């Protein structure tokens, strides 16, 4: 374990394919830096997974790494206002606000992290059909 004070005195690579110095020019992938400054590094730490830098209302988002980050902040601060299933005992509980969304689907862009907020077993929305096309000015 490290807290923010030992974060001062460490040296991280991000993914375990970057620990061994790797092998091109393919226009699909992503470009890690070379880290050719230290010829002989002493890495002491490597991340378990980078999508573990997120918050709980942030790991829900499908591919956060392809957006303009105010929209990431907006999606995380809207994910809390989903209609869905809040706890499974809404028969006996008496609460001043409760709303069940009828037909909740686990998203086809699930993560690997949504196993650990159970959201694939309690979702709060649906898959409906996207069609990004100006049709009659109603989506101006």
């Amino acid at each position: 374990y490290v807290d923010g004070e030992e974060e001062e005195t460490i040296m991280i690579a991000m993914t375990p394919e970057d620990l061994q110095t790797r092998s091109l020019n393919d226009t699909a992938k992503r470009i890690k830096p070379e880290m050719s400054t230290s010829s002989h590094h002493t890495f002491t730490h490597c991340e378990i997974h980078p999508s573990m830098i997120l918050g709980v209302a942030a790991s829900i988002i499908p591919f956060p790494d392809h957006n303009q980050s105010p929209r990431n902040t907006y999606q995380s601060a809207m994910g809390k206002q989903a209609m869905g299933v809040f706890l499974t005992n809404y028969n006996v509980r008496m609460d001043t606000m409760a709303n069940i969304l009828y037909y909740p689907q686990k998203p086809l862009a699930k993560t690997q992290a949504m196993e650990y907020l159970k959201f694939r077993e309690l979702p709060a929305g649906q898959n409906a059909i996207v069609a990004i096309a100006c049709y009659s000015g109603y989506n101006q």
């Binding site: 699909a28 392809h66 999606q75 086809l108 993560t111 649906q126 898959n127 096309a133 049709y135 989506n139």
Partner: protein
């Protein structure tokens, strides 16, 4: 799931949708002009990965920072018998005369935010006034009134039609009638009226 938000602008019945070659119609149509400045290209990547994982029938790992490129998704959508970059040739529902540009089209995960319109519609003729100041009350829950605030009065001054302002701050509010003695100038004058 990328903030491209908004309200249900309009409702169309089933036939009036555009519809692709198989019969699939859509249900939610975000705007082209919602995209190119907001720069949310992840939303397109989600729609594409969605359509592929629907057709090959399983849930594709969209946890970020993998080697999942766009190229694998492109090749798989093509090699399962489709266009490579999403589009299908969609139609007018009012003619069937083909939509000149091919339309991008798929499933995506949607959600429902807690606001509705049935909780923020409110209008008010009259009604509940406070005892303390006789100006109409504050809050939705007691059917209050709106705050025709400072800077609204500022723009009324800018237009200048102050007779509207004398409507607003006299007549749809605490219109109130007092008396003055013309010598000491005050409002101490006790008012009995049926004895006058």
């Amino acid at each position: 799931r990328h903030g491209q938000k908004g309200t249900i602008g309009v409702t169309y019945r089933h036939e009036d949708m555009p519809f692709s070659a198989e019969g699939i119609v859509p249900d939610l149509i975000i705007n082209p002009h919602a995209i190119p400045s907001r720069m949310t290209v992840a939303h397109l990547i989600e729609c594409l990965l969605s359509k592929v994982g629907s057709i090959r029938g399983y849930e594709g790992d969209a946890t970020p920072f993998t080697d999942l490129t766009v190229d694998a998704v492109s090749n798989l959508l093509r090699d399962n018998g489709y266009q490579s970059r999403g589009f299908e040739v969609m139609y007018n529902g009012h003619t069937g005369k083909k939509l000149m540009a091919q339309v991008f089209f798929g499933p995506t995960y949607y959600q429902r935010l807690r606001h509705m319109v049935d909780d923020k519609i409110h209008a008010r003729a009259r009604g509940p006034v406070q005892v303390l100041t006789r100006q109409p009350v504050e809050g939705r829950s007691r059917d209050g009134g709106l705050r025709f605030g400072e800077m609204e009065r500022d723009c009324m001054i800018a237009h200048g039609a102050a007779g509207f302002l004398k409507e607003r701050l006299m007549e749809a509010s605490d219109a109130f009638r007092v008396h003055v003695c013309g010598i000491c100038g005050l409002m101490s004058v006790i008012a009995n009226l049926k004895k006058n």
